[PDB]
């Protein structure tokens, strides 16, 4: 019903600015205030500001004066937040949330825009197979290595295989490139009846890699 739609993850360079949208629908846009909340990876929620779409009146947290700017477009029912003079401290997920100007809770949130502030160049990943050698349950996977920035999505057999799939959080290697593994556990008997393909999508570099994971028969 009520939907707050934010843009997807975005890589931005330090010393620049970025403008994050929050398109509202399913309710009277001018009847609610739009708040913005910052969340660093693994941390809590911190309040950025508040804007009244009826008149454009803004209230900012003191911690974000000069850093964040809140605007609204009533005709398009969209709220915006612009972050200036970007540094690595600004790397976080930014949520927009709906609330009543008068003591209202934040009852509906956007899905959050993950902003990465880095001067590193976009790099597509290499996909290597995690092949098992021939118990009763077998495990196989794909190593998605040396890419930047986050994220990559991994599906198995074009999304037809979902049970038993574990796609781990990416880890930042000392080289400054990310790396993650996606694994799936299947019946050992299915290694000879089913073809297992991991579908890796790296949207920041427009990279789609499909890698068949061929098991090794070993006496």
């Amino acid at each position: 019903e009520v939907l707050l739609l934010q843009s997807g993850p975005e890589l931005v360079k330090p010393g620049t600015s970025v403008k994050i949208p929050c398109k509202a629908s399913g309710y009277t846009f001018t009847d609610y205030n739009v708040d913005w909340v910052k969340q660093r990876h693994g941390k809590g929620l911190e309040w950025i500001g508040d804007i009244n779409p009826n008149n454009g009146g803004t209230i900012y947290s003191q911690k974000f004066k000069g850093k964040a700017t809140l605007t609204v477009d009533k005709s398009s029912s969209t709220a915006f937040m612009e972050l200036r003079s970007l540094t690595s401290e600004d790397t976080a997920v930014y949520f927009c949330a709906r609330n009543y100007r008068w003591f209202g809770a934040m009852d509906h949130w956007g899905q959050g825009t993950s902003v990465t502030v880095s001067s590193a160049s976009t790099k597509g990943p290499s996909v290597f197979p995690l092949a098992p050698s021939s118990g009763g349950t077998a495990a196989l996977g794909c190593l998605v290595k040396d890419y930047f920035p986050e994220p990559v999505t991994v599906s198995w057999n074009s999304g037809a295989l979902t049970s038993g799939v574990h796609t781990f959080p990416a880890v930042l290697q000392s080289s400054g490139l990310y790396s993650l593994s996606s694994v799936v556990t299947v019946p050992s008997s299915s290694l000879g009846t089913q073809t297992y393909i991991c579908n890796v999508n790296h949207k920041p570099s427009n990279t789609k890699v499909d890698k068949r994971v061929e098991p090794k028969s070993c006496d």
């Binding site: 708040d35 909340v37 809590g44 929620l45 911190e46 309040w47 508040d50 209230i59 947290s61 003191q62 949520f95 949330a97 609330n99 003591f103 209202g104 809770a105 934040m106 009852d107 509906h108 949130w109 956007g110 899905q111 959050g112 290499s126 290597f128 197979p129 995690l130 092949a131 098992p132 050698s133 349950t137 495990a139 996977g141 190593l143 290595k145 574990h166 781990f168 959080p169 990416a170 880890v171 290697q173 790396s179 993650l180 593994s181 694994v183 556990t185 090794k216 028969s217 070993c218």
Partner: protein, 218 residues
């Protein structure tokens, strides 16, 4: 600014039992009949979801297992009974005055029964070796508790400082964790040795499980 002190920072509650999370405010959140205390539930990857507003108004769509109470400066949210889908981080937030402030958050871990991991080891692919780098991966699958002791062994010698790990969030269905460890060596160092092993010690294992492969075989 109204500072919200949320306790505990974390807690483990078994399914069926009661989880109690508290939030203490630096000043009163009462105002003309209201108690503007709001509780949120945030599961990993998702935005926070409003559970309770006005200190005790359970939002439409939230199960009755959640209940909020309190007034003035001391507030409490209760989960009874705790379910396995309740694995998340919970925040308190005041809407009494500006600036809006959040509590530190409370990570609720579902305390299930002991589960020993299923261990798998993967050799580096021939394709990666062409780049001069060897990545050896060890998988610890569907275990609980989160505390898992594992160690890499190269020709039976314990390794340290040359591996990175990653752990999944607690599963919403079976309340387990999975862990993947990647051992990184140069191709030359990889060719210098034969036996690569992953050794796991866990509460659910009667004896440590070791998975290994020989570099040449298979």
């Amino acid at each position: 600014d109204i500072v919200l002190t949320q306790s505990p920072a974390s807690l483990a509650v078994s399914p069926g039992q009661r989880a109690t999370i508290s939030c203490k405010a630096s000043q009163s959140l009462d105002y003309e009949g209201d108690s503007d205390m709001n509780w949120y539930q945030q599961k990993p990857g998702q935005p926070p979801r409003l559970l309770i507003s006005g200190a005790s108004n359970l939002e439409s769509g939230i199960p009755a297992r959640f209940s909020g109470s309190g007034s003035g400066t001391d507030f409490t949210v209760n989960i009874h009974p705790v379910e396995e889908e309740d694995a998340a981080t919970y925040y308190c937030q005041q809407s009494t005055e500006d600036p809006r402030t959040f509590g530190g958050g409370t990570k609720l871990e579902i305390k299930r029964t002991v589960a020993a991991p299923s261990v798998f080891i993967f050799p580096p692919s021939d394709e990666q070796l062409k780049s001069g780098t060897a990545s050896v991966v060890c998988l610890l699958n569907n275990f609980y508790p989160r505390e898992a002791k594992y160690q890499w062994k190269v020709d039976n010698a314990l390794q340290s400082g040359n591996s990175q790990e990653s752990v999944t969030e607690q599963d919403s269905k079976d309340s387990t964790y999975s862990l993947s460890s990647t051992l990184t060596l140069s191709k030359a160092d990889y060719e210098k040795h034969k036996v690569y092993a992953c050794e796991v010690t866990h509460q659910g294992l009667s004896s440590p499980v070791t998975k290994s492969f020989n570099r040449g075989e298979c």
